[PDB]
Structure 1
C-alpha cells in the first residue's frame, strides 16, 4: 500500500508531483471542468426546483415494493442519479420504537456516560468529547444485532447493491446477492444540542482519491476527460482503493452508508442533509486541478479528514444541499459511498432524534477478510477493529451474544 508508506509530512510534495502529472495528462483540465460544472448545475437546479415545489429530491421507496419486486426502472434510474434513497417500512414502527427504548435502557443500566467520562483524556478535548455524547461507541446491543440480521433489511441491501454494475472484464467485483454485516455505532441527538459533526463531506478517502493509483482507476474517466463515461455505480476498482491509515479508515467497502430511524426524523430536528448528486465527486476531483488552486493543495483535502465540499471551493454544490425525507421509526435512508452529506446543525424538535448506523456491504474478498476480527470483537464485547478500543461493552449487562443470532445473522457475521 503506497498510501501506507507515505509520511504525513510528505503529503504536500506528493500532491504537487501528482497534480503536475494530472494536469499534464489532461491539459484541457479547465474546459473539462466547465463541461462537468454545467452538468452539475443542471442537477442543482432540478434539486432546487424540487425543494421549491415541496418535493424532497431524495427518492423514496417502500420496503414492501422492493421485497415484492415492484420497483420500476425509472425509480432505479432516479436512485442512481441522486445517489440516495429513503426506504420506508423496513421494520415495523412498534419494533423500532421498542428498540429505541431498549438501547436507552442498555446505555442507562450500564452507566455509559459515567464510563465515557471516566475514560476521557484529562484535557479540554477529552472533556469536550465526553460531556454530552451524541454518538455512542456501543456495537452489540440486542437492537443493533437484530436490526442488522433482519430478513427485510437483507432484501433491501441486496436491492441497493444490485443497482451497481458488479461485473467487468470477466470478474465479479462483489456479489450483490450476498450481504455481510458491518458493526457500527448509534446516535442519540437531544433537542437544542449543537452539532460538532462534520461539515458536508464524503467518507472513504480524501487526498487518496488523487494520490492513489487505485482510486484514480475508479475515477479514470474523470481524469482522462471522458467524464460522461464516469459511472458512480461501477464497482470495478472500488474494493482495491488504498487509504492513508488513520481512524477514519473503514476496513470494508460499503456501497451505501445508511441510517435506521429509531425515532421520527424531521427537518430542523437533527436530521441528515445530503447533496443528492451521485457524480458530484467528478466536480470535486476536477475542481482541485484548476489554476486558482495552489500547486500543493487539493482544495483543503487533508489526511484523516473526510473529503469536504465547501462554500469556498464548491459553492455550486452547496446550493444543492437538501434534508432527507421525513422518516418514521423503522424507516431507513441510504446514500452512495461518494455522496456528500452532513448532519443538520439545528435540532428544535421535542424529543431525541436517534438512529442506528447500518450500511450496505456486499460480499467480496476485502469485506470477508474483516469478518474474523470483527467476530472476535463481538465474542468479547470489544469495540470492532475500525473503532477506538474503548471496549465499553465487555462487562455490559444485556450485551447481545450468538444466542441472539438467526442463521442469516451468523452467515453475515462469518460464523457460518
Structure 2
C-alpha cells in the first residue's frame, strides 16, 4: 500500500500514494474537514471567551490535591478537554531554586567553563535525578498517565503507575536574553504520522472520516510507534517541564494549542485540494512537524501562553499538542526549566530504560542526544547507588 515501518527511500512517492489512498477512503475530505473545523472552532471560541475574561485557559491544579488524591472529576475532564495542565507548587519554590543552585555548584566543581536559551549538556546532576525519582514526580506522572485510556478491550497498553527515567537537559535563560524562540510544532514524529502503520491505526478514525469516534486519549498502538532514523526513543503521554525559576508573562514563554484533537486537523490538511502533490504542508525529513498560519490558521489563532509561574510549578501537555516558545527581546526575569516528561512503562520504553541505565552508570550523554559525555569523569554525579526503589523500577531494574 503506502505505509512503511521505516523511512521510505522515496518519501515523496510514498506521500503521493498515501494521498490517493486516503482521499479515496475519505471520499469527501473537504466536507469532513469543514465539520472538523467547525468542531475545533467551538473550542477556539471557548478559549477566546476565557481570554476575554482574563480567565485561565490552561487547567490549573494544586499539587496538594494531586498528592491527596482529591482532584475532582471536573478537573480531570478539563485537562482532557484542553490537553495540558499547570501543577502549582509541584515542588516548593525553595526546593526548585535550590536545585538550580545545586546544578550550578555542580558545574563549577567540575570546571564546566574550562572543559566546555543555553541548553546545558548535563543529565546526571543530583538535582535532576532526585527530581525525576521523587515521590512528587511519581504522583504527577501517575495522575497524568491515568487520564489516558490505557486499557482497551482485553489489553493493557502501558503501566500508568511507572514512568521511565528519561534523561534530558536543563535550560537557563538569564535576564537580558534575546531569543527568536521556537515556531509552533508537534513532536513524536512528523512524516511517520501518515506513513507509519502504527499511526495509521492510532488515527484510523481520522483517516476514515469517523472523527466523532477519534479519541486523542486512546493509547492503543501509540506504544508501537517507532520514529524514523534520519529523535525520541520513548513513548510519552505528556511532555513537560518543571520551573527552576519564576517565569513572567510575555517573556518568551511556552505556548500551546489547548485542543488535543487539533492533530486531526493537521493530519487532514495536506489532503485538501490546494496542496502540492509531493508537499505535506511544511513537513520535511528529519524536522519537527510545523504548524503555521499559512496551512493551519484556525489552529495558530488558538496558541495560548502558560500563565505566570513560580519556581516549583510544572507544566504539561499531551503528546499530540501543538506548542511553541514565543520570542523575547531583553527578557525580564529568568527562564530556567528542567525537562521531565511522562513516559509510561511498556515494551518500547523498557528497551530505552536499559540504555538509560547504562548511560547513567557511565555518566555519558543519553542516546537521544548529542554525544558530548561531559559528566563521565565528574564528581558529585548521581550514580546507581543513589537510586531509590522507584528510580530502579523506572529503569526497568
* TM-score, normalised by the number of residues in structure 2: 0.96
The answer for the alignment partner of 1:217 in structure 2 is: 201
Whether contact under 8 Å (1:252, 1:370) holds in the other structure is: yes
The answer for the alignment partner of 1:55 in structure 2 is: 55
Matched, 1:374 2:356: yes
Q: 1:313 aligns with which of 274, 290, 295?
A: 295
Whether contact under 8 Å (2:247, 2:310) holds in the other structure is: yes
Aligned ranges 1:179-258 → 2 under 5 Å: 179-246=163-230, 249-258=231-240
The answer for the alignment partner of 1:119 in structure 2 is: none
Matched, 1:154 2:138: yes
The answer for the alignment partner of 1:123 in structure 2 is: none
Query: Offset at 1:311?
Result: 0.9
Whether contact under 8 Å (2:5, 2:197) holds in the other structure is: no
The answer for the alignment partner of 1:388 in structure 2 is: 370
Q: Please give the secondary structure, in 2, of the residue aligned with 1:393.
A: helix
The answer for the alignment partner of 1:64 in structure 2 is: 64
Bigger mean CA deviation after superposition, 77-86 or 388-397:
388-397
Matched, 1:83 2:67: no
Query: Offset at 1:356?
Result: 0.3
Deviation string 1:188-244 (CA, Å, 9 cap, x unpaired) is 112332335431010011111111121111001000101011111100010112322
Q: 1:334 aligns with which of 316, 328, 336?
A: 316
Q: Please give the secondary structure, in 1, of the residue aligned with 2:171.
A: strand
Residues 371, 295 of structure 1: CA spacing in aligned structure 2 closer, same or farther, 3 A cutoff? same
Q: How many residues align?
A: 395
Residues 113, 232 of structure 1: CA spacing in aligned structure 2 closer, same or farther, 3 A cutoff? farther
- Measured in 1, the distance between the counterparts of 2:111 and 2:257 equals 37
Matched, 1:6 2:13: no
- Measured in 2, the distance between the counterparts of 1:344 and 1:91 equals 25
Q: Please give the secondary structure, in 1, of the residue aligned with 2:250.
A: coil
Whether contact under 8 Å (2:50, 2:56) holds in the other structure is: yes
Query: Offset at 1:3?
Result: 4.2
Whether contact under 8 Å (1:244, 1:303) holds in the other structure is: no
Structure 2, unmatched stretches of 5+, are none
Q: 1:404 aligns with which of 386, 393, 396?
A: 386
Q: Please give the secondary structure, in 1, of the residue aligned with 2:310.
A: coil
Query: Offset at 1:4?
Result: 2.5
The answer for the alignment partner of 2:103 in structure 1 is: 103
Whether contact under 8 Å (1:86, 1:331) holds in the other structure is: yes
Structure 1, unmatched stretches of 5+, are 117-132
Deviation string 1:367-388 (CA, Å, 9 cap, x unpaired) is 1111111111001000111111
Aligned ranges 1:271-350 → 2 under 5 Å: 271-346=253-328, 348-350=330-332
Q: 2:129 aligns with which of 131, 141, 145?
A: 145
- Measured in 1, the distance between the counterparts of 2:36 and 2:146 equals 27
* TM-score, normalised by the number of residues in structure 1: 0.91
Whether contact under 8 Å (2:182, 2:327) holds in the other structure is: no
Residues 293, 114 of structure 1: CA spacing in aligned structure 2 closer, same or farther, 3 A cutoff? farther
The answer for the alignment partner of 1:120 in structure 2 is: none
The answer for the alignment partner of 1:263 in structure 2 is: 245
Bigger mean CA deviation after superposition, 25-34 or 64-73:
64-73
Deviation string 1:235-256 (CA, Å, 9 cap, x unpaired) is 001011232214xx21110100
Deviation string 1:110-168 (CA, Å, 9 cap, x unpaired) is 3435544xxxxxxxxxxxxxxxx621121111110010011021011100000000111
Q: Please give the secondary structure, in 2, of the residue aligned with 1:327.
A: coil
CA RMSD, Structure 1 to Structure 2 (Å): 1.6
- Measured in 2, the distance between the counterparts of 1:357 and 1:250 equals 14
Q: Please give the secondary structure, in 1, of the residue aligned with 2:160.
A: strand
Q: Please give the secondary structure, in 2, of the residue aligned with 1:282.
A: helix
Query: Offset at 1:269?
Result: 2.1
- Measured in 2, the distance between the counterparts of 1:181 and 1:313 equals 36
- Measured in 1, the distance between the counterparts of 2:269 and 2:7 equals 27
Query: Offset at 1:47?
Result: 1.0
